[PDB]
Design an enzyme around this catalytic site. Sequence first.
Site, short mmCIF file in Angstrom:
data_model
loop_
_atom_site.label_atom_id
_atom_site.label_comp_id
_atom_site.label_asym_id
_atom_site.label_seq_id
_atom_site.Cartn_x
_atom_site.Cartn_y
_atom_site.Cartn_z
N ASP A 117 0.74 -1.24 0.00
CA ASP A 117 0.00 0.00 0.00
C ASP A 117 0.79 1.32 0.00
O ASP A 117 1.22 1.80 1.06
CB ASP A 117 -0.90 -0.17 1.21
CG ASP A 117 -2.10 0.72 1.39
OD1 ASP A 117 -2.16 1.85 0.88
OD2 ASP A 117 -3.02 0.23 2.07
N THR A 118 0.90 1.99 -1.15
CA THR A 118 1.61 3.26 -1.26
C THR A 118 0.84 4.39 -0.55
O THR A 118 1.37 5.47 -0.24
CB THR A 118 1.79 3.65 -2.72
OG1 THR A 118 0.51 3.78 -3.36
CG2 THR A 118 2.63 2.61 -3.43
N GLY A 119 -0.45 4.20 -0.32
CA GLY A 119 -1.21 5.20 0.38
C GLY A 119 -1.12 5.03 1.88
O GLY A 119 -1.83 5.80 2.52
C1 LIG Z 1 -11.48 3.35 -0.14
C2 LIG Z 1 -10.07 2.90 -0.22
C3 LIG Z 1 -9.30 4.12 0.20
C4 LIG Z 1 -9.97 1.70 0.73
N1 LIG Z 1 -8.60 1.30 1.05
C5 LIG Z 1 -7.97 1.74 2.11
O1 LIG Z 1 -8.53 2.54 2.87
C6 LIG Z 1 -6.54 1.22 2.33
C7 LIG Z 1 -6.53 -0.05 3.22
C8 LIG Z 1 -7.57 -1.10 2.87
C9 LIG Z 1 -7.46 -1.87 1.70
C10 LIG Z 1 -8.42 -2.84 1.39
C11 LIG Z 1 -9.50 -3.05 2.24
C12 LIG Z 1 -9.61 -2.28 3.41
C13 LIG Z 1 -8.65 -1.31 3.73
C14 LIG Z 1 -5.72 2.26 3.04
C15 LIG Z 1 -5.55 3.54 2.26
O2 LIG Z 1 -4.42 3.27 1.49
C16 LIG Z 1 -5.40 4.81 3.15
C17 LIG Z 1 -5.41 6.12 2.35
C18 LIG Z 1 -5.47 7.35 3.26
C19 LIG Z 1 -4.34 8.15 3.43
C20 LIG Z 1 -4.41 9.26 4.28
C21 LIG Z 1 -5.61 9.57 4.95
C22 LIG Z 1 -6.73 8.77 4.77
C23 LIG Z 1 -6.66 7.65 3.92
N2 LIG Z 1 -4.21 4.88 4.00
C24 LIG Z 1 -4.35 4.70 5.29
O3 LIG Z 1 -5.50 4.47 5.71
O4 LIG Z 1 -3.21 4.77 6.09
C25 LIG Z 1 -3.05 4.00 7.25
C26 LIG Z 1 -1.65 4.23 7.77
C27 LIG Z 1 -3.94 4.49 8.38
C28 LIG Z 1 -3.24 2.52 7.02
C29 LIG Z 1 -10.51 0.46 0.02
N3 LIG Z 1 -9.96 -0.34 -0.91
C30 LIG Z 1 -10.83 -1.42 -0.91
C31 LIG Z 1 -11.85 -1.19 0.02
N4 LIG Z 1 -11.61 0.03 0.60
#
Ligand SMILES: CC(C)[C@H](NC(=O)[C@H](Cc1ccccc1)C[C@H](O)[C@H](Cc1ccccc1)NC(=O)OC(C)(C)C)c1ncc[nH]1
EC number: 3.4.23.16
Lengths: 99, 99
Positions: free
Chosen positions: B25-27
Amino acid sequence: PQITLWQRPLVTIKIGGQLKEALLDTGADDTILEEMSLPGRWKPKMVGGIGGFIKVRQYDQILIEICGHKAIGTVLVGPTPINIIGRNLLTQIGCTLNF
Amino acid sequence: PQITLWQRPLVTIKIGGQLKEALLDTGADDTILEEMSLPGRWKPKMVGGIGGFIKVRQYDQILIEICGHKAIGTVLVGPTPINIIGRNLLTQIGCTLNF
Ligand SMILES: CC(C)[C@H](NC(=O)[C@H](Cc1ccccc1)C[C@H](O)[C@H](Cc1ccccc1)NC(=O)OC(C)(C)C)c1ncc[nH]1
């Protein structure tokens, strides 16, 4: 271009004439933008991350330019803390992860 | 390797002599793992994602191998929906975004 991850991967995007900074997120399945006006009909959806779920408005076939490259796809709009370009448009500009 | 993004970028990581699947995860600024038992003391951290904030436990100097690359750093353990390899460990195995 090649982008290092020493710093967060923020890029300028152009959507509906407005220019914006967005995070290139490979952990994001969909693209989510902060609250804005987009033309067309939308459908409601619930999306989940760390912390839980938020309600967003889903718009299909929105054109967005990511560093000069045009890309078209579903864009979710809602109470996101940062604009996120997810995998659905990252694939369209040819973005890959390498090591 | 070069990883395209038509699918979620999931890899096998080895931690504690156990193999697990994690998302590149780059985000994500940090690396968060689902609940587990790690050696040592931990200190507290608040982390905010798309749905708000979670409280996690921080462990420092943990060895984790991501696709046969050994990384040693800070790993957060807490109520995450999925194991997340964040930028703090993606920079140590030499990962970049390219388009
Ligand atoms: C809506 C997107 C953003 C969401 N993905 C994320 O939130 C992923 C993780 C995830 C993947 C798959 C299933 C559940 C969780 C994390 C994001 O990369 C988020 C993006 C972000 C950055 C800064 C502020 C707010 C948000 N990064 C993030 O939450 O960072 C931390 C360090 C808290 C893990 C997603 N992908 C699939 C389902 N939901």
